[PDB]
Design a protein around this ligand. Structure first.
Ligand SMILES: Nc1ccn([C@@H]2O[C@H](COP(=O)(O)O)[C@@H](O)[C@H]2O)c(=O)n1
Ligand SMILES: Nc1ccn([C@@H]2O[C@H](COP(=O)(O)O)[C@@H](O)[C@H]2O)c(=O)n1
Ligand SMILES: Nc1ccn([C@@H]2O[C@H](COP(=O)(O)O)[C@@H](O)[C@H]2O)c(=O)n1
Ligand SMILES: CC(C)=CCC/C(C)=C/COP(=O)(O)OP(=O)(O)O
Ligand SMILES: C[C@@]1(CO)OP(=O)(O)OP(=O)(O)OC[C@H]1O
Ligand SMILES: C[C@@]1(CO)OP(=O)(O)OP(=O)(O)OC[C@H]1O
Ligand SMILES: C[C@@]1(CO)OP(=O)(O)OP(=O)(O)OC[C@H]1O
Ligand SMILES: [Mn+2]
Ligand SMILES: [Zn+2]
Ligand SMILES: [Zn+2]
Ligand SMILES: [Zn+2]
Lengths: 157, 158, 158
């Protein structure tokens, strides 16, 4: 059996940098407003993984209303989601993540992001892709109001 | 033997009175959605993903804005009919995953019923259907309460 | 038997004179698309989907906006070079599905020609390439006619 999933997330800028994306602290004039650590990339990825396993989404598994997850390490959440996916008999095919942001520059950090995500999913780095694109000053990402991220995931068996 | 991927995306603007129909579910809201059909963004994006996997183009290439026969149409009927044409070509369902993007109303209490509706229209197990929701934290047209967007991916098997 | 999924997304802003180039096709329009290369949002998003599935990064990494060698670049050359690298890694094409998000110009008449170009660029049959277009009902930056967005998913086989 092969199964696909798709995730999508958005956080607004606010407060002071740095931002955490893909598990990586990236310097920036602004921070990301969030109940958790604000990791848009890892939230979208988790949604894509949960989606492929028909387990719902981060909001189902870890509510924005529970004080246990305030300030939470989004990597913990990723690892918890992954344990529950594996408990259902799933194994990783591949993941592909798309960070949508006018700034900061993401490319320097992508290698460490992939290190983190490969480790969290107990897979090879070769099964994890991350990329970035701007929207050329258009939309809320273009105007510097926030960052969006998508992910797809392919699961096996 | 063969596996195929599809992607769909759809947007409707709010307008007039509630309720809204999303994933076939009547959801109470102070506003409705503007559409030629019933406005089911979630089912429109799903349909587009299924047709795209089967390389049959899209929902426009089957049910045009022009035709007055599709006015107020049950998007489930469109879904079932696109599904018939996809099956006519040899494909069976792998799985589908749908992402509703909206600031409001809350979608989560309605997701189980949406999945029941979609699993039936596609003749599959409910375990092959996933629906989720996310806000854009007040950002963009969805964040400002102007509309709702939905995305879907589908895997088909031949 | 190994299959891999990829996703790409891109946006370009309108500006300067038409025509625009989308999916390889010169499309008459009142404004152009501002880019470093020729501005083909569709092929960029598609290239990213393919590169993503192969875990080769993205177009910005492969073809930096800083390098003058890519000024005015034919996006189809970028697509074919990315594809060559993916194939060197042992991948063959499952299928692709592309969604153009634009208020105008009208994409439908041009889609057959886009599919021919993409099919040629990937050494595949047209059956394995789906392209569709949709609007966001006058919402957001595409709805206001500010630019054009494109998403793509891809399935690769090793
Ligand atoms: N319109 C919406 C948007 C999100 N939700 C749910 O609430 C949770 C929190 O929303 P966000 O992920 O957008 O911060 C989501 O995970 C989703 O399950 C909802 O029920 N209705
Ligand atoms: N830029 C666009 C947008 C939509 N369209 C067509 O309009 C149909 C319906 O899309 P919308 O009603 O969301 O605009 C699609 O099937 C597509 O063929 C187009 O040809 N060019
Ligand atoms: N926030 C961003 C946006 C884009 N990028 C990178 O810059 C390059 C070009 O981005 P654009 O597609 O928006 O022109 C890509 O390589 C992308 O990986 C980045 O490193 N950080
Ligand atoms: C998920 C996808 C494919 C989104 C692109 C669709 C779109 C037109 C967004 C508008 O930008 P916006 O949300 O920033 O609206 P605005 O520019 O009016 O703030
Ligand atoms: C991830 C969760 C978990 O507290 O927190 P946020 O940081 O608000 O992130 P988002 O994906 O916007 O909402 C889902 C929440 O469940
Ligand atoms: C469902 C159809 C047909 O009435 O129209 P709407 O419901 O308005 O949705 P839209 O995204 O404008 O186009 C898709 C059409 O197939
Ligand atoms: C395609 C490249 C080539 O210089 O430039 P642009 O044509 O500006 O397109 P975009 O996707 O915005 O940037 C990525 C670059 O690789
Ligand atoms: Mn998407
Ligand atoms: Zn989040
Ligand atoms: Zn629609
Ligand atoms: Zn581009």
């Amino acid at each position: 059996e092969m199964r696909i999933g798709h995730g999508f997330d958005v956080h607004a800028f606010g407060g002071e940098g740095p931002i955490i994306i893909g598990g990586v602290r990236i310097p920036y004039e602004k921070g990301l407003l969030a109940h958790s650590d604000g990791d848009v990339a890892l939230h979208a990825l988790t949604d894509a993984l949960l989606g492929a396993a028909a387990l719902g989404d981060i909001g189902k598994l870890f509510p924005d209303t529970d004080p246990a997850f305030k300030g939470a390490d989004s990597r913990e959440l990723l690892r918890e989601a992954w344990r529950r996916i594996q408990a259902k008999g799933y194994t990783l095919g591949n993941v592909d993540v798309t960070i949508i942001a006018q700034a900061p520059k993401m490319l320097p950090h992508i290698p460490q992001m992939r290190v983190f995500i490969a480790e969290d999913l107990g897979c090879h780095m070769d099964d994890v892709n991350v990329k970035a694109t701007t929207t050329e000053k258009l939309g809320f990402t273009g105007r510097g109001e926030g960052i969006a991220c998508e992910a797809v995931a392919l699961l096996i068996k």
